[PDB]
Design a protein around this nucleic acid. Structure first.
Ligand SMILES: [K+]
Ligand SMILES: [Mg+2]
Ligand SMILES: [Mg+2]
Ligand SMILES: [Mg+2]
Ligand SMILES: [Mg+2]
Ligand SMILES: [Mg+2]
Ligand SMILES: [Mg+2]
Ligand SMILES: [Mg+2]
Ligand SMILES: [Mg+2]
Ligand SMILES: [Mg+2]
Ligand SMILES: [Mg+2]
Ligand SMILES: [Mg+2]
Ligand SMILES: [Mg+2]
Ligand SMILES: [Zn+2]
Lengths: 198, 57, 48, 40, 272, 350
RNA sequence: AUGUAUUAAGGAGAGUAUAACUUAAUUUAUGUUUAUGAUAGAGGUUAUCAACA
RNA sequence: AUAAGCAGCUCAAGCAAUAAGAAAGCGAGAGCGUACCUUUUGCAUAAUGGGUCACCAAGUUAAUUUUAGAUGCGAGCGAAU
RNA sequence: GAUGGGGUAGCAGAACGUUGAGUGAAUCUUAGAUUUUUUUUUUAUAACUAAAUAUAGAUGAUAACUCAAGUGAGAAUGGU
């Protein structure tokens, strides 16, 4: 559709259509310039050899070395070289949500979960795969001692230790080649409460 | 049939004198002005007047 | 010594020096593919 | 096609049609069909 | 959010998507900021469309380089002329509309497309309202949708008020043309929409019925669905095509009594 | 870059010059082939043929441009055709003479002589282009050569108010073809009827320049042979440049002027009268002599056509196909000159 | 398809956390090594973020 | 829209490019020409076969025994240590 | 100023094309490799020129010579 929309803007000139005021495409049911929830949230399941490829640069699907709360830099797509903080971390598709206003994108809301006065299209935060983002952490200049931000291209787990009675583990992430142990981001534990039925 | 009818001899049978005729006997309705067939009653005014005589009488 | 490319032909005619100005004035990529990257819409969905 | 329930996208194209025909708004060429660098 | 996953999840998961949509509507809320959105909610900001309107900027950029080099190879040539196809696209509006899948056949609907061909949209709608065919009611609905697209998307049919002035305020003489078929028309509004072209195509198979004949024989009957395409144009296309036919008739020269016909046999001697 | 080194070694200050340098013409394969295509003598170096291809619109300098060669060439081409046309058809009307001079040495035929030599034009003038291409600037409006004709005081009125110009003043006031005298950049555009004129002008000036270089290097006699071989060898049906208004009246003034008895139209033959396509053959006879004959479908048209054929025969009188030219005398010793026929002029009638 | 190695009883019905399999249909423990592996965090359903024996 | 074409071939008017240059295509009109295959002494044959198009669909492999050409060794050759 | 020229059954010679393979960890490709089209040229079952559309850096295409065949279809009341 973009291959034909650009040839018309070239040819028609001052008669270029107003495609934003057009009806939906009955093939997929989307409006002009809007994605679909399945394609804007990246909730489509991926193969197991894909999850290992998306996480290849940061450990493995079961030893992931990136956590929510740590700033990352985008390295793919239109919004390249963008920097934001990870809000969510979907470990099923290996997709990450960055709550930046530049990653928003129109999406068509299905009418089975929308009132009759609500606008059909809304702007939601689009998610990215883990492979499309690298870690940004401030390091110290060994020559001058000045702190500056750098992009971490690879992470690997270190000092892994399991606790069989509790089925837990605690490891450390470091930068291969330079051996810079990067501390984990401040993660708040889930709030556990005592219910009346317990 | 002995042979298959060609594209020419089948197109003659289908469209030569079998073009749909445009209805030209259309007049407006005096009460409302809507287009109706000639010598015929308006379908939108018939129902409305037919329903207007059922409520009050 | 080397293959004559469509770029070489235009330089001989004289048209190339004008093309560099237009492409540069429009922010288009002269003799390149620019800083833009490969299509990733299908790659992000897990396409193989 | 005559029996399909008109959706929200078909109801907004009928309000624009009556706004252009009436004369309230003036039609103008589209500006978001494609992001070309020529802008002509 | 699928229709079969919306009920397979707990309320907490569902009630977490509503706060996402709710918080998305507080940022969307006088004139400069209210014109960046359509009534359907489509945000007309570049960053929000770049992912759909410009999915492949690496290929669009190179294609736009192909058209700029091809445009400078013509501006250099002193003998170049704008192609006839490039000059009409930027001067004459056009809308190609493909209807939905109609439950009929091609040999039935073909006669309903030849009836509205060449007629104006207003003339064609009056013939679908008073036709006896069952598919004429569907062609009247699909012709109203195409007209809405033409007026809104393409801008056609929006010059009436201006044209009505010249005819009456200035007592101007309207244009008189003759269609390719030969019908004489008198065009007072050159923006009037009409049905330039129209053709019917065949779609998927609606269904399959079984025909139980004698001797335990069965035959398959395919239920057909079909579509129609309408190419809507303004009356400026017919006023241009008529001037071309008239110019081609005044360019063939007049009829001469004694023409100079060629002798097409060459022989290596004189016969006179 | 490193993978694509430049095909032609050139200094960095070469894409800015208006035209390639003179020494660049000594390394181009297009000039060496163009020089050998026209069989030019080795007296004309390649640095001179290159100058002929640089139009004055690509270079404002008087040197490096066609301005001076194209002038010296136009004078020779015009003079050699003028004398040859007057010796071949001594009775041509002056308006037809202008049309026939323009039919041989005009911008239209000279554009075809340049295209028959395999002369490819350059897109835009620049120092980088090889000197073997005809380079000119078609977007510059004011480029023109110097002519002998003067500007008319009433030029504005003639165009605006349709004033009358005449055909006896055109010889002095106007140019050699009778026409009146003085009648950054963006390449996102299309051709123009004004640019097409500049394209015709550039080609004509080049063909004229080649004759200017032949004259300077090889001398007068070499230029005359070049014009005689490439320009005068073209064929033209001068009988097709005639347009008559009231020919029957003009033919009557002719016989009256020459003292011939009045012309009488006689019906030599006819067939198919009272039909859709009749044929009438009428012959115009001055006394017993038959001046001209014409056949047409209408009796009146046949009489008009017969009168035109008689007038064309008067004007298209040729002593010979290859007549002697007054220019044949100034060269090496030739036979004494014999006076050529001088006609009074075309008849002026009602 | 051939070769190598190992082994020497097979199927169905119904039910079940729809990768997980038998009304317990995701049981419970050991040892070792855990990024220099093997081939100093968050996470018990927002689960099974660990493989081998 | 006055015509009795296996729709090809030979001859060919004319139409066809807004513009310098550039005519593919369609073709009136004249003539020549009774599809293909199989099977037969012989088929336009009213003898057999085929609605159209796409795809699938037939002298191959093994052992054995020969011949020609080329080439290795040579009253030895090949095989094998 | 060489000689020769229809052809069924049949016999013989010489080639092209298709698929896969070796040389190949080779050559070429956003300065456009590849695009079932169109077009141009060459004694031409074939390749080539150009044009138009799309956009690939190799799970891409490829000359030349060679190797092996599930290798060439208007014909089987053939089959899908
Ligand atoms: K076979
Ligand atoms: Mg822990
Ligand atoms: Mg039965
Ligand atoms: Mg007839
Ligand atoms: Mg028999
Ligand atoms: Mg028969
Ligand atoms: Mg038969
Ligand atoms: Mg049959
Ligand atoms: Mg086969
Ligand atoms: Mg013979
Ligand atoms: Mg033979
Ligand atoms: Mg292609
Ligand atoms: Mg078959
Ligand atoms: Zn009424």
């Amino acid at each position: 559709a973009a291959v034909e929309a650009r040839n018309e803007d070239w040819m028609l000139g001052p008669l270029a259509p107003r495609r934003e005021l057009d009806e939906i495409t009955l093939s997929n049911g989307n409006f002009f310039g809007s994605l679909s929830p399945t394609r804007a949230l990246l909730e489509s399941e991926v193969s197991e050899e894909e999850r290992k490829a998306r996480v290849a640069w940061c450990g493995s699907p079961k030893f992931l070395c990136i956590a929510p709360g740590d700033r990352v830099v985008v390295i793919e797509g239109h919004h390249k070289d963008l920097i934001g903080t990870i809000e969510k971390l979907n470990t099923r598709n290996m997709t990450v949500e960055i709550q930046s206003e530049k990653l928003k994108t129109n999406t068509t809301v299905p009418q089975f979960m929308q009132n009759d006065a609500d606008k059909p299209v809304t702007q939601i935060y689009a998610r990215l795969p883990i492979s499309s983002v690298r870690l940004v952490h401030p390091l110290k200049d060994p020559q001058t001692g000045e702190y500056r931000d750098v992009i971490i291209r690879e992470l690997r787990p270190r000092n892994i230790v399991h606790d069989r009675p509790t089925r837990t583990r605690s490891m450390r992430r470091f930068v291969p080649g330079e051996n810079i142990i990067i501390p984990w981001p401040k993660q708040e534990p889930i709030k556990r409460e005592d219910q009346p039925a317990d | 049939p002995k042979k298959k009818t060609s594209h020419m001899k089948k197109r003659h049978r289908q469209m030569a004198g079998k073009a749909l005729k445009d209805v030209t006997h259309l007049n407006r309705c005096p009460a409302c002005g809507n287009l109706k067939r000639m010598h015929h009653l308006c379908s939108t005014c018939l129902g409305k007047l037919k329903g207007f005589m059922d409520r009050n009488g | 010594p080397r293959r004559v490319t469509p770029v070489d032909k235009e330089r001989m005619v004289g048209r190339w020096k004008v093309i560099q100005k237009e492409l540069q004035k429009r922010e288009l990529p002269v003799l390149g593919t620019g800083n833009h990257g490969k299509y990733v819409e299908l790659k992000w969905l897990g396409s193989k | 096609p005559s029996q399909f329930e008109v959706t929200k996208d078909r109801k907004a194209i009928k309000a624009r049609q009556s706004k252009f025909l009436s004369g309230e708004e003036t039609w103008a060429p589209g500006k978001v069909n494609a992001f070309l660098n020529s802008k002509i | 959010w699928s229709l079969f996953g919306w009920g397979k999840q707990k309320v907490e998961e569902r009630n977490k998507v509503k706060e996402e949509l709710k918080q998305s509507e507080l940022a969307r809320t006088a004139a400069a900021h209210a014109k960046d959105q359509t009534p359907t909610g489509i945000s007309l900001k570049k960053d929000h469309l770049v992912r759909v309107v410009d999915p492949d900027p690496r290929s669009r950029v190179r294609w736009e380089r192909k058209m700029v080099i091809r445009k400078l190879q013509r501006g250099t040539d002193p003998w170049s002329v704008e192609p006839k196809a490039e000059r009409i696209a930027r001067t004459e509006r056009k809308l190609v509309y493909k209807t939905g899948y109609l439950p009929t056949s091609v040999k039935k609907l073909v006669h309903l497309s030849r009836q509205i061909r060449g007629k104006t949209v207003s003339e064609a709608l009056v013939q679908m309202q008073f036709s006896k065919k069952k598919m004429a009611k569907e062609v009247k609905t699909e012709l109203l949708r195409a007209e809405a697209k033409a007026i809104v998307t393409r801008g056609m049919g929006l010059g009436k008020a201006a044209a009505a002035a010249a005819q009456k305020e200035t007592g101007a003489e309207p244009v008189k043309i003759q269609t390719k078929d030969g019908k004489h028309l008198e065009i007072r509004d050159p923006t009037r929409i009409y049905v330039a072209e129209t053709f019917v195509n065949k779609g998927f198979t609606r269904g399959v019925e079984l025909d139980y004949r004698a001797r335990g024989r069965v035959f398959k009957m395919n239920k057909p669905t079909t579509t129609m395409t309408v190419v809507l144009k303004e009356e400026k296309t017919r006023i241009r095509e008529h001037q071309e036919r008239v110019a081609k008739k005044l360019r063939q020269g007049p009829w001469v009594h004694l023409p100079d016909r060629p002798v097409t046999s060459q022989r290596q001697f004189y016969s006179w | 870059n490193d993978r694509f080194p430049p095909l032609e070694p050139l200094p960095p200050a070469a894409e800015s010059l208006p035209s390639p340098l003179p020494e660049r013409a000594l390394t181009s394969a297009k000039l060496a082939a163009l020089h050998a295509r026209l069989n030019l003598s080795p007296k004309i170096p390649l640095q001179t043929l290159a100058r002929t291809l640089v139009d004055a619109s690509a270079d404002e300098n008087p040197q490096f441009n066609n301005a001076n060669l194209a002038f010296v060439g136009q004078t020779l081409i015009n003079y050699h055709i003028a004398e040859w046309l007057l010796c071949k058809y001594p009775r041509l009307p002056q308006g037809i003479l202008f049309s026939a001079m323009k039919a041989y040495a005009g911008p239209k035929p000279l554009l075809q002589i340049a295209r028959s030599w395999g002369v490819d034009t350059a897109a835009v003038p620049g120092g980088e282009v090889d000197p073997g291409l005809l380079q000119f600037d078609a977007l510059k409006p004011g480029v023109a050569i110097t002519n002998f004709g003067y500007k008319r005081t009433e030029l504005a009125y003639l165009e605006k108010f349709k004033w009358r110009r005449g055909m006896a003043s055109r010889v002095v006031l106007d140019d050699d073809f009778g026409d009146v005298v003085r009648s950054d950049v963006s390449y996102d555009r299309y051709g123009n009827p004004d640019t097409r004129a500049a394209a015709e002008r550039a080609h004509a000036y080049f063909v004229r320049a080649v004759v200017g270089a032949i004259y300077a290097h090889c001398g007068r006699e070499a230029a005359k042979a070049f014009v005689k071989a490439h320009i005068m060898s073209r064929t033209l049906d001068i009988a097709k440049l005639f347009e008559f208004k009231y020919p029957t009246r003009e033919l009557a003034a002719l016989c009256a002027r020459e003292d011939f008895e009045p012309p009488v139209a006689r019906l030599l033959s006819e067939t198919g009268r009272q039909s859709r396509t009749p044929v009438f053959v009428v012959g115009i006879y001055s006394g017993s002599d038959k001046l001209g004959e014409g056949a047409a479908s209408s009796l009146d048209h046949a009489r008009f056509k017969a009168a035109m054929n008689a007038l064309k025969a008067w004007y298209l009188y040729s002593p010979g196909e290859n007549p002697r030219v007054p220019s044949d005398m100034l060269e090496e010793g030739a036979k004494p000159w014999t006076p050529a026929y001088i006609d009074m002029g075309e008849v002026i009638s009602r």
